[PDB]
């Protein structure tokens, strides 16, 4: 088979993980995180050799790893990093590591900084060689002032030890990492908007084309890559792209973190193989729904920006980038927000819309107002005062918004209301019915 084309897997039961296979071992912080424990846990191992291998090496094992970017969009990284690897220009190539955790329902990103900052730094270094990056910037939310310092501290130990900097790890190649704590705003998790943030402009995103691979920060070739996408990379280059294909079923290859929260007995974050049944996971590492599996009204698998799925359709769901797509939902950040059978889903979703209304730069005609419209309609629905035809407005308005906006945020605002109408429309009808009868 060609250099890419990750080997297909031939396993049916994608059950639990083996803690040897858990790359993020220090997650939950049971062990030291400073460079003492890190090199005790094998955090900078043969980096000199791997970096020396070159970009053709690194990109290739990434390809055969078949890794799909965990940034929420889901496009694979091997092609992304390959685009960076195109010479023929005198530019200062850069690498941006988006550490934004703006996505409601998502908390995985925070803990990587808080418990394995060294792992990320090592990963940025190996990737930065593959991207020919002159340097890199670890953009981070302004809501994590303590993490950002924590990363700054890890950068201190690395610079002082000589792991990263000029002649990093004795390879001679130079690479410096900087920390930019963007004043929190959810939109900054976008590639282009982040780049605008670093540049100091307004913060609103940009049209595509050109892509960051064409022109990015400072009008220079760059890529925004998610924290997890980077953090896994050095382990892949250190453990084997074949092994990483050992997990996963198909194009949805590898393993991912999960953040289970909501009406849940013992919500937490779990490292666990992708391509798993959701019910099995909820009963393994989670303890199960507070009211038991039966007392379940719906789960949002990708966290916010993702349509909800009801219990019946949820009972047999394969958790992965694929599979869920067939079930009419996007895995997003694998942020599972679960609600018991007894709660106002409608005003749960209305809260999401208010979040979008408050979190939308306001550059595009649909998104600067259309979410504002959806907010007005949903508020009226929640209070029960609306003609049933407004079911169709929300359906048909949502189609008008989706696809015409610049950054994917509009789609994140469009989908949840589409899911709500598709699967819990009878609830809205009853809510409207009760209001009318009292009226």
């Amino acid at each position: 088979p060609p250099p890419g084309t990750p080997p297909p897997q031939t396993k049916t039961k994608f059950g639990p993980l083996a803690d040897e296979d858990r790359i993020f071992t220090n997650l939950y912080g049971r062990h030291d995180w400073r460079l003492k424990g890190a090199l005790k846990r094998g955090d900078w191992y043969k980096t000199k050799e791997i970096v020396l291998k070159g970009a053709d090496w690194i990109v290739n094992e990434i390809k055969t790893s078949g890794l799909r970017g965990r940034g929420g969009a889901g496009f694979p990284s091997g092609m992304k990093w390959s685009f960076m690897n195109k010479p023929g220009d005198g530019r200062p190539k850069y690498l941006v590591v988006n550490a934004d955790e703006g996505e409601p329902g998502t908390c995985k990103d925070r803990e990587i900084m808080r418990h394995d900052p060294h792992k990320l730094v090592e990963g940025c270094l190996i990737a930065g060689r593959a991207m020919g990056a002159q340097a890199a910037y670890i953009y981070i939310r302004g809501e994590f002032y303590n993490e950002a310092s924590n990363m700054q501290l890890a950068i201190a130990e690395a610079y002082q030890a000589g792991l990263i900097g000029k002649n990093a790890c004795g390879t001679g190649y130079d690479f410096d990492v900087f920390m930019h704590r963007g004043a929190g705003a959810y939109i900054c998790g976008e590639e282009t908007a982040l780049i605008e943030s670093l540049e100091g402009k307004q913060g609103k995103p940009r049209l595509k084309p050109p892509f960051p691979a064409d022109v990015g920060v400072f009008g220079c070739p760059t890529t925004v890559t998610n924290v997890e996408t980077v953090a896994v990379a050095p382990t892949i280059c250190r453990r084997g792209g074949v092994w990483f294909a050992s997990f996963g079923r198909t194009r949805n290859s590898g393993t991912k973190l999960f953040n289970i929260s909501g009406h849940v007995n013992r919500p937490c974050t779990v490292e666990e193989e992708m391509s798993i049944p959701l019910k099995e996971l909820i009963e393994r590492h989670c303890g199960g729904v507070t009211g038991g599996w039966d007392n379940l009204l719906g789960v949002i698998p990708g966290g916010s920006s993702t349509p909800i799925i009801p219990k019946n359709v949820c009972d047999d769901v394969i958790m992965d980038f694929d599979g869920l797509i067939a079930a009419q939902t996007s895995l997003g950040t694998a942020a599972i927000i679960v609600m018991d059978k007894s709660t106002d889903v409608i005003k749960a979703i209305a809260r999401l819309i208010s979040f979008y209304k408050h979190e939308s730069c306001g550059q595009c005609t649909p998104c600067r107002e259309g979410i504002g419209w959806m907010n007005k309609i949903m508020t009226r629905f929640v209070k029960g005062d609306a003609q049933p035809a407004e079911i169709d407005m929300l359906w048909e308005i949502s189609k008008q918004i989706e696809g015409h906006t610049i950054c994917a945020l509009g789609d994140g605002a469009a989908w949840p209301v589409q899911g709500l109408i598709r699967h819990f429309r009878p609830e809205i009808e009853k809510r409207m019915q009760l209001h009318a009868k009292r009226v």
Binding site: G29, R30, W33, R34, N146, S149, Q152, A156
Partner: protein
């Protein structure tokens, strides 16, 4: 240690209280008291350290 810790200023308080925040300490298992020991100005103080190491920046204007 040759890989020293960050400057003493960047460290809000020298860890002496052991259990901090939710029960972190160098002893106990949740071994990250350093996270809860960050000052109002810890961030900026970090870069003050980092004037030493960072390499020349690219320049567009010649």
């Amino acid at each position: 240690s040759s890989p020293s810790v960050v400057g003493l200023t960047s460290n809000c308080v020298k860890p002496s209280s052991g259990p901090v925040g939710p029960g972190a300490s160098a002893t106990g298992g949740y071994k990250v008291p350093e996270y809860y020991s960050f000052n109002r100005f810890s961030y900026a103080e970090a870069e003050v350290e980092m004037a030493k190491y960072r390499c020349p920046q690219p320049s567009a204007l010649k």
